[PDB]
Homo-oligomer: A and B are copies of this chain.
Amino acid sequence: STAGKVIKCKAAVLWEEKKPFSIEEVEVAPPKAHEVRIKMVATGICRSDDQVVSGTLVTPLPVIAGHEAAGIVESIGEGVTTVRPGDKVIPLFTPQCGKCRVCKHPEGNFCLKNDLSMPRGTMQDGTSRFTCRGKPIHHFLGTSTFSQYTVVDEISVAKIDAASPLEKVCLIGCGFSTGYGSAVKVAKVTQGSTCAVFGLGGVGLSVIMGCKAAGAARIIGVDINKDRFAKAKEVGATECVNPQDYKKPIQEVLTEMSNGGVDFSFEVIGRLDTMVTALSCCQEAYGVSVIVGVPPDSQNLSMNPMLLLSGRTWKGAIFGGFKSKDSVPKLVADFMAKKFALDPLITHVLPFEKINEGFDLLRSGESIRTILTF
């Protein structure tokens, strides 16, 4: 019925920075070769989507944002072989083309087809599938999940278990997997280690879950909002510290708590100063610090390279280092098997139509993750 035809549906369009989303009718073109059109079932509100609104994460406007979602394939373009109409799917903000140097590397996951490094806001072919008020609307990271229907390149979608609860697993599309993988895959947290986690929102909580899963003996939560501490301890933090409580810089406090520095630190906020703090708080000879949070556009940090010379390792990762198309289905399967929990991350649920209230809850600090249902 809708196959091969333009679909008119509602989407949350962001016409300008620092403005509310405008929920309105958009036209969604049918999928071209190697593209997939998806009816969205649920989508998470991630801090990154808000950074697009704030303008600290830069991507071309106007745009349909949203990148953490789950849905059902409405139709496929010519040539698609990995999903079919009716399949449950999670769109991948980091693609997996499977052919580039990175996809073929055993460790890398930042596929060269990503739209993150030099964002164009289009499909892989350099055009848009979205029209609103007669004007072309940009995509975001090849996903654009703030729409009843979106179109994504095949390399940016993964087929998941047919029995998956889409209102929970959308988190595997961003927040959960990013935090969990930062701990278990990127940092490679070891059994008996001490970890510090800067930022106790959805992603930071996921890092704590990964730290616990890996067998960390101590997991120190760091956040300026003490209301986050309860849930952090629930998912595995052994102690929580608020830097505003201390007269000395937090890296000194943590170094003292850990009796000379932590084995593993994680910056999960997106501030330049906390990236440097987190690197400093790891043990100077063998510590590892992982940058997860997204820094403000085009800003450089300043640091003393002697921090590195002594032995520290500093690294960052997108999407927890997971090769996206390979891992998402495996992660969903693991979820179905009760290997990890997602409920602790979801604090609010709202209809898609209340997306602006959802962003208000994030901005206010009230929610961890709000899931929007279509």
The CA-CA distance from A54 to B294 in the complex, in Å, is 39
Of A72-80, A205-213, A311-319, A346-354, the one with at least 4 CB within 8 A of chain B: A311-319
Name the interface residues of A300-332: CB closer than 8 Å to any CB of B. 300-306, 308-318, 321
Assess the B312–A315 pair: CB atoms within 8 A: yes
Question: Given A284-B110, A302-B301, do A317 and B309 touch, yes or no (CB 8 Å)?
Answer: yes
Given the interface pairs A101-B283, A259-B101, the reply to whether A291 lies near B316 with Cβ below 8 Å is no
B300 touching A303, Cβ below 8 Å = yes
Q: A101-B260, A117-B310, A299-B304 are in contact. List 6 more A-B contacts (CB 8 A).
A: A101-B259, A108-B286, A110-B285, A112-B260, A303-B303, A310-B318
Q: Which residues of B contact A286 (CB under 8 A)?
A: 102, 105, 107-108
CB neighbours of A295 from chain B (8 A): 304-306, 309
Residue A333 CB within 8 A of the other chain? no
- CB 8 Å contact bits of A214-255 with B (1 = contact, 0 = none): 000000000000000000000000000000000000000000
Residue of B nearest to A291 (CB): B308
Is A372 interfacial (CB-CB < 8 Å)? no
Known contacts A303-B303, A314-B315; A309/B283 CB under 8 A: no
Copy number in the complex reads: 2
* Chain A positions near chain B (C-beta within 8 angstroms): 101-102, 105, 107-112, 117, 259-260, 272, 275, 283-286, 291, 294-295, 298-306, 308-318, 321
**Shortest CB–CB separation between residue A348 and chain B, in angstroms?**
28
CB-contact partner of A105 in B101, B285, B317, under 8 A = B285
Which residue from chain B places its CB closest to the CB of A287 in the assembled complex? B108
B272-A311 in contact (CB<8A): no
In the bound complex, CA of A275 to CA of B22 (Å) = 46
Leading 8 A-B pairs by shortest Cβ distance: A308-B316, A309-B316, A108-B285, A110-B285, A108-B286, A313-B315, A102-B285, A300-B302
Question: Which residues of chain B are within 8 angstroms of A285 by Cβ–Cβ distance?
Answer: 102, 105, 108-111
A309 to B317, CA, bound (A): 5
**A294 proximity list for chain B (CB < 8 A):** 309
Contact of A311 among B300, B301, B304, B321 (CB under 8 A): B321
Chain B residues with Cβ under 8 A from A314's Cβ?
Answer: 308, 313-315
Point out the residues of chain B lying under 8 angstroms from A303, CB to CB. 300-301, 303
A291 to B313, CA, bound (A): 10
The 5 sampled A-B contact pairs (Cβ below 8 Å) are A109-B285, A272-B305, A309-B316, A311-B316, A313-B314
Please give, as numbers and ranges, the residues of chain B lying within 8 Å of A283 by CB-CB distance.
Answer: 101-102, 108
Q: CB-nearest residue of chain B relative to A271? A: B305
- Distance A314 CA – B279 CA, assembled complex (angstroms): 11
A112-B260, A283-B108 known; A311+B317 contact, CB < 8 A: yes
Return chain B residues, CB-CB under 8 Å to A306: 295, 316
CA distance A65 to B102 in the complex (A): 46
Q: Are B315 and A311 in touch, CB under 8 angstroms?
A: yes
A310–B319 CA distance with the chains assembled, in angstroms: 10
Chain B: CB-nearest residue to A290: B308
- Chain B residues in 8 Å Cβ range of A309: 291, 294-295, 316-318
Nearest-neighbour CB distance to chain B for A323, whole angstroms, equals: 11
